[PDB]
Symmetry: C4
Subunit: 457 residues, 4 copies
């Protein structure tokens, strides 16, 4: 029995020289790395095509429909006078009507199809305001019914009015322009793929929710991919996907067999004992990782086949699945380096250090979260790097690693002459956080890790 | 007696299993964390509304009143010819007079109300120059009485001259335009709050104090919030604030009772001894922190209630109080992790290391301050990162942490061809500071911290 | 025999006091450092002249031929309407025809010389489209023969039509403008060199391969250097090159003699032994480095002489050879510091640490490569820092060293509102990579290096 | 005798309790810190005034005389057509002639005064070209006499032609415009100082030395300060300078007396011995530092008095002297912390570590210099961060500290498609340098420093 357990925990070379076992799993792992990486790159080709089409069309729409737009001005593009706003709205509508004559792309109009478009209408120009608004700052008084009323003007695409629009400025909530355009992604021909039919839903927003005299203007698009009706293009990916599936399936079967054998050996040993952690010694975590990677790879390959068959269009989900599977396949090869001490430093140190590291992180995390919330709420209105909770976490994590420090300090230097108390608070906040986390938290973290390494040295 | 002292220093679980004590303070701490964080976020909503209103109105004013203004040009916006300055001034006044017809916001005029406006005057256009100025650079001579004379033209808002302004360029100190606008912060309705009435005091400055042929132009605003006169809006925060106050009060009472018990036990022990540091062993600093946090939270909640009641408008003070209280509430939960060694590494190391760290910082601080002053005065006129003492401290602290180094070096590369001696001095200054502080000071600092950790390992 | 081996491993001073040997190699090394560095700088003069000529001419071409071009707009310069594209094309052609009257430089036209220019034609204006293209997005259908058809209009340079161009927009692949200009690099006279004759091949591309309504416009140049036909300029570099060659040749001969002596001593010792690593003890790696440096220096000097003689024009290859040789010459002087322990810390630590460091890097590299591939494919379409594999490696290597962290996080903040799943994946990817590599991999790497140092301490 | 030496090495408190000695030097040091810092700030006021005047006048000149100039365009401002160059030159001359009517500043003209101005001429417009230039790129030939010929047109300032200029474009070396303007720095009145008279020498350069079709345009100024002739301004710095001088003189005398006493004690001890390093134990380096600081402070104060007296105008030299003296005064206070071990960690570690650190730097410096030269010559023409040797050193030093890594990599990504060999070389160069210096050099440096600290722990 003892020899059986000794063989169970033996390296591939030792196992071979003991029982002449062929190391099929190692060669399978190498082949998997190669084929999975190649498949990921091949998929990335089509993913890039789709993304490029969407973003390039969006940029073209911004240049076509936004009056006076230039690249890099997205977050400051705004109107400041009634005349500017009217001109921008009319420019957008006029460009929509003139698209077939001026645009470099080939677009088709879409009519009807539910709200906000009536039947036969291509463009909806809607203004939303308050049901009752009387604003008299001269008398410091107002009378408001905040229920929002929407008034929409319908414009039919030209056959191959909106100029009377009167905006209720003092109670205006916003103005929106909605329309849809159909186009074809011809560039797919370069990848020997049949072009898809795209529908872009375009929304242009003139936002007055702040009632501050400045109305920002933005353009957004939603892309819907569809198979074209009986297209025609004059005159091995499926087989490669099948090969990937076969390799992953064989690897999954072998790993499952190994896991079952380990479970049976664990049962036999426990029986021969006439605990839990001692039972986990028989569970190969690397093989759990391998089977998870195989499942992810097979699911991603099926999704990729479906997308190429035009049954699906979830490019992002497929990309995430395949990329995660590729990373896991690359990582899984360390299972065989684990057998040799000189090549196993990282894994051994991680194993020894994880408990204390997690316990330390438990205590550090509450301080981190307190700082996150405090900065988010107090400094967010004044600091571009504290606008949202996730952004605050990113900024603080970067500061812990010594990145982007002076710019973080400098962003607040504008408030020194206007909101001095907030500036002083920001000084204390930033100095205390940086000192505490760089000099105390990180030092102890590295000390724990290096002491764990010293243990297994 | 000894058993009493032993119990006094026992963990919540040990205390429970000894005397069946319910750990009310721990549950109170958890509830406090939750409710205080929620309160901070809820307050942040209104804080953001107010700040957004102020800044957006200021940006709109800059676009409305500054001729040729564009975003991002604030620190270089200037006039360079007499005609440009006259056009800018007249544009500002004309836009002030045309505001009701062109602005997207709804503004009301303010008249009189003391200097610099006379009764019935909405806008004050003032030029300040020298009482006697005769400047003859051709003869290298001048005759100056530096007493400043102010001449103001009053403009009444239009009923629903300044064009004869003659600037004394050779002795002109500056030109200012002052006016006030009233508006209403309608966006508050989205938060189910009654809109406030804002008065913006707008100051436009054309600054010629340098007499250098370049006159920078700036716009600044001061916002005053007030309750509107009998407003009308058609059809649980107070209760949540009350709940926060109740939780904080109960926590304060429990902590005070614990502190009193500790003080009584300290007195009894000293009496049984038939020093100072030995007495401080009976003072729970965590409970001092907790009572301070409770006081801050209660004060912030009272201020927030007052602001919501429109009795106050000090948003920044309330935000600082509540954010600091939230951070302290999050930190205070470590008092219970302190009882377990594996989770107490950070606090124990801090306790052991603070004295030596402070002694080391004492010596390092004088070198830091010498560098700060030297850089501020020598390099400040030439380096954008050394303009002020606080900016110098920020730059040097970032350099200590390895941040923003090459840009700091590059800012001086422009003076290599013009002021070479200053450039060489900057080379020596920067190299010496970086080497000394990164390689010697920081190494010893981390060594002290890690040795202290080794002591408590 | 033992004394012979002892003397073989003796330092230059010890060798001199033993046998009165003159340390010629050390003096040769110092002289080599001096002369090789001087030669590198002297070559850099001409290299800079050539590179400046090319780049400045390219910038001038961009300003001359691209309608509305401005500096810094290269990667966003594009057309968005049919009229803009026609105007840009016609502007390029008209400027090509008007060059002799408007350009600040002096250029000559080139005619014929093969495709795409016919005989006597200076400019080729070609449009490439699909052989058959019928695109009907209204009916969601198309009929495409993707064979590319090129149609070219030839323009002869003016004697000292293209306006009828009709673009097939719906099936247009791209438009190109090809022409060549001849000029003379007169600035070489400042270096006392005869000016060369340059031919610039200019390609202007209007790219429509994405069919997205946005057509980027770019200009590229290829420079061909040639000797001018019998030029005339009115009224020691070769000798310095000869001196460098002589010094390197003598150093090479001495190093080869030393290596032969070491090999013979190794043979004698092995014979007196009546393994491999023991044999390598007799091989001076520093002398292998020195002979390699001598070969590189001699080859670079020959190439430099040929370039100055106008027989060659491979400035980049010569620069790389000479710079690498200079670096190796500077490095080789450490061979003599190696004899003294206090000055040999770095080399001794490297010797002791290299095996373990390489073994560690073996395991770390697979994780690094998995991350590289995953990021390249998943995030490349959305992140400017992940566009290519080399860019991904640069970004990840910078992140390992704590550089450019917050900007990497912020680049993805735009996808939070639009592609949230990809944003969440990017969050996990970046956080996991940074934590794992900064806190675990780097800590162990430094620990291995410092332990190796402790061994030789 | 032994007691005398024991007293010689005794702390101020111990010395006082032994012989009742008053610690005058310590109080003098504190007073020196205060007064020297205050003096530095007071001087910085005037230094800032002067620097601001110069820079603001230069910016105003750029906006006045450069056609189409805008802020931030200095390094790309250039002309690209003959018409643009003619318009820029004529605009500069016309603005010079129209200055009295358009400028916001008040300037006086300067006539004659030697080359390049003839008697009575205010502006010199010179073109420099080749004596003989025949350039025929069509025939690939030229005939050049590179002797430079200058032709100058003189323009007299308007009483309160150059339009016939014909540029020889094909052999033009450059065009320059020279003129001088006199003005008065009135802002000094705010500091209660008499305004100085400034003469600005303005040089505008249109540079064609590259003959590349692009002519960059630049403006530079030289400022000369002078005392105005009998100025008149209607109705304690000297005393503070005297106080600083008195304090520094007393400190210098006390330090010199202490040094003499130490020297005499050293002589007596050596005599009682009936080496060098043992003699250096009697030399107080802190007092050498103090006397050097006193000399610097006194010289700076004298120079400052002279500048305020208008006998000198060397603001930069005075600022450097005073700032260095302030830094040294702040540093010198550590002499008294040196007596206590807990506060003497830094100095003791530096003393123990300096020899080994210097020996290590000796070996590292040759590698650093090899990299510097190689990068400067090979990558300088292609990389904005490698243009000059000092800039290369700054970039490499920043990279050693992990700063600005990704941007350094990205600057070369433009050459990947054009000069691929140089790009690959840059890849190898940057990766090798960063790895070697961050992971090996710095680790050993910190290890040496921390081992030295461990010695004195
Ligand atoms: C009698 C029990 C029930 C029936 C079992 C039948 C099994 C059968 O036939 O093959 C098993 C091997 C396993 O191949 P593979 O998994 O590479 O090899 C096994 C593992 O090394 C395992 O250790 P771990 O890797 O640590 O889990 C070890 O215990 C097994 O020896 P042991 O059996 O003495 O315990 C090995 O056989 O499979 C192939 O080597 C590829 C076959 C396909 C080749 C063509 C591919 C296109
Ligand atoms: C006889 C002396 C004078 C009268 C004293 C009357 C006291 C009374 O009644 O309760 C005290 C407890 C304290 O609750 P709490 O503070 O959670 O618990 C105490 C602490 O654990 C204290 O240690 P530290 O935490 O280290 O300071 C410990 O010494 C006390 O035991 P000891 O008394 O044997 O010394 C505990 O009672 O209060 C509640 O547990 C919540 C009550 C409100 C529940 C409803 C809330 C809505
Ligand atoms: C008898 C054997 C065959 C014939 C050999 C004839 C050799 C001859 O003549 O000179 C050799 C020396 C070598 O000069 P150099 O290489 O500087 O010096 C030798 C090295 O130090 C070598 O050790 P490593 O440096 O560790 O390899 C050492 O073993 C040799 O001693 P050893 O001979 O007792 O073993 C030295 O002679 O050359 C000159 O010092 C410059 C001559 C040119 C001066 C003018 C320049 C313009
Ligand atoms: C007999 C020898 C020749 C005549 C010497 C006459 C000297 C005289 O009169 O004063 C000396 C002291 C020195 O003052 P000060 O330098 O502060 O004090 C001396 C130092 O502490 C010195 O040690 P280090 O600091 O380590 O070098 C120590 O050896 C001397 O004692 P010792 O003499 O027993 O060796 C001290 O007198 O001066 C004042 O304390 C300020 C006087 C001005 C006060 C007004 C200022 C406005
Ligand atoms: C927190 C910081 C730690 C350490 C880096 C050791 N340090 C200095 O090196 C010098 N130093 C200052 O004196 C200072 C004042 C204000 C802001 C920043 C700094 C600063 O960095 C130091 C010294 C004293 C107190 C704290 C510290």
């Amino acid at each position: 029995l003892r020899r059986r357990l000794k063989y169970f925990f033996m390296s591939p070379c030792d196992k071979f020289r003991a029982k002449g076992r062929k190391p099929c799993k190692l060669m399978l792992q190498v082949v998997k790395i190669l084929v999975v990486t190649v498949q990921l790159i091949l998929f990335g080709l089509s993913n890039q095509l789709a993304v490029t089409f969407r973003e390039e069309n969006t940029i073209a729409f911004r240049h076509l429909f936004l009056l006076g737009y230039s690249d890099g001005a997205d977050d400051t593009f705004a109107a400041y006078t009634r005349e500017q706003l009217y001109q921008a709205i009319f420019h957008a509508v006029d460009q929509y009507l003139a698209l077939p004559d001026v645009s470099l792309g080939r677009y088709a109009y879409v009519r009807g199809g539910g709200d906000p478009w009536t039947n036969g209408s291509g463009l909806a120009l809607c203004q939303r305001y308050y049901h009752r608004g009387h604003v008299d700052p001269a008398n410091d008084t107002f009378d408001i019914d905040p229920m929002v009323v929407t008034d929409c003007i319908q414009v039919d695409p030209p056959e191959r009015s909106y100029k009377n629009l009167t905006l209720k400025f003092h109670k205006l909530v916003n103005v929106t322009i909605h329309f849809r355009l159909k186009t074809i992604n011809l560039q797919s021909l370069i990848n020997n793929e049949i072009p898809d039919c795209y529908t872009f839903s375009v929304l242009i927003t003139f936002d007055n929710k702040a009632h501050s005299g400045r109305i920002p203007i933005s353009l957004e698009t939603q892309a819907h991919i569809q198979e074209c009706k009986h297209p025609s293009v004059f005159q091995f990916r499926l087989l490669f996907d099948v090969v990937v599936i076969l390799t992953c399936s064989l690897s999954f079967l072998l790993c499952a067999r190994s896991l079952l054998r380990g479970f049976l050996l664990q049962n036999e040993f426990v029986g021969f004992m006439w605990s839990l952690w001692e039972r986990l010694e028989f569970v190969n975590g690397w093989y759990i990782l391998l089977v998870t990677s195989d499942v992810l790879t097979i699911s991603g390959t099926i999704m990729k086949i479906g997308i190429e068959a035009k049954n699906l269009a979830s490019y992002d989900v497929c990309s995430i699945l395949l990329g995660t599977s590729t990373l896991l396949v690359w990582v899984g090869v360390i299972r065989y380096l684990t057998f040799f001490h000189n090549y196993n430093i990282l894994i051994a140190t991680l194993r020894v250090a994880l408990p204390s590291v997690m316990r330390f992180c438990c205590c550090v995390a509450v301080i981190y979260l307190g700082y996150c919330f405090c900065g988010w709420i107090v400094l967010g209105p004044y600091h571009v790097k504290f606008r949202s909770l996730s952004m605050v976490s990113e900024c603080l994590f970067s500061l812990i690693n010594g990145d982007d420090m002076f710019v973080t300090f400098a962003a607040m230097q504008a408030q020194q002459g206007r909101s001095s108390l907030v500036w002083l608070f920001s000084q204390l906040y930033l100095y205390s956080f940086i000192s505490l986390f760089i000099y105390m938290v990180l030092s102890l973290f590295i000390a724990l890790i290096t002491g764990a390494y010293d243990t297994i040295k």
